[PDB]
Amino acid sequence: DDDDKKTNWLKRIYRVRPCVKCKVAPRDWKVKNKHLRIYNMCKTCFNNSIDIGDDTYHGHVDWLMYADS
Amino acid sequence: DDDDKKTNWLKRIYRVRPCVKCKVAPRDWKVKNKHLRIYNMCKTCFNNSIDIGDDTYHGHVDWLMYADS
Numbered sequence: 810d811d812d813d814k815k816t817n818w819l820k821r822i823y824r825v826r827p828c829v830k831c832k833v834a835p836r837d838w839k840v841k842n843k844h845l846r847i848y849n850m851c852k853t854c855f856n857n858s859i860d861i862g863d864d865t866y867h868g869h870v871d872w873l874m875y876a877d878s
Numbered sequence: 879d880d881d882d883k884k885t886n887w888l889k890r891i892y893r894v895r896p897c898v899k900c901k902v903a904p905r906d907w908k909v910k911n912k913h914l915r916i917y918n919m920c921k922t923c924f925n926n927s928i929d930i931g932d933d934t935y936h937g938h939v940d941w942l943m944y945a946d947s
């Protein structure tokens with residue numbers, strides 16, 4: 810079933826690319842209608858970057874959660 | 879830049895999962911507004927399946943080509 814191909818790719822995408830800043834924790838994310846937004850950083854590193862005033866790694870990639878648009 | 883993360887993931891997704899039927903040729907695809915549709919089969923296997931009357935592997939997965947929806 811094609812929705813499972815999409816789902817399994819998303820599970821994999823989320824798993825193999827950890828937080829861009831600390832490289833170990835997995836990334837923060839949220840569900841955004843029919844998209845999954847994967848933020849570049851875990852929450853700890855995100856809150857940290859506000860504290861240290863660095864916005865270099867701020868960002869996200871949205872992913873349609875279904876096989877068919 | 880976040881659009882490049884999306885693009886590089888798509889280049890990889892397309893590269894490591896070949897046609898579901900013959901497992902060697904890369905898949906057919908088309909550009910569909912702001913989505914990239916990756917069909918489950920290469921064209922040769924798709925046209926073949928119509929000939930042999932098998933629709934088991936028919937299908938596709940659409941991918942938003944941008945980082946931000």
Ligand SMILES: Nc1ncnc2c1ncn2[C@@H]1O[C@H](COP(=O)(O)OP(=O)(O)O)[C@@H](O)[C@H]1O
Pocket residue numbers: 837846848849850851852855866867868869
């Ligand atoms: N964990 C995180 N890592 C990196 N960037 C983040 C993180 N959380 C939020 N951001 C960034 O902060 C901004 C606000 O995000 P968000 O709340 O998703 O926007 P919206 O207001 O459209 O819902 C965006 O630039 C987002 O990329």
Ligand SMILES: Nc1ncnc2c1ncn2[C@@H]1O[C@H](COP(=O)(O)OP(=O)(O)O)[C@@H](O)[C@H]1O
Pocket residue numbers: 906915917918919920921924935936937938
């Ligand atoms: N190379 C292929 N491999 C597998 N399935 C395919 C292939 N080409 C077309 N199909 C299937 O045939 C049907 C028609 O596809 P398409 O032309 O993308 O639909 P639309 O008419 O919405 O543009 C869909 O079920 C699609 O998945």
Ligand SMILES: [Cl-]
Pocket residue numbers: 871872873940941942943
């Ligand atoms: Cl996508």
Ligand SMILES: [Zn+2]
Pocket residue numbers: 828829830831832833834850851852853854855
């Ligand atoms: Zn982190």
Ligand SMILES: [Zn+2]
Pocket residue numbers: 897898899900901902903919920921922923924
């Ligand atoms: Zn094939």
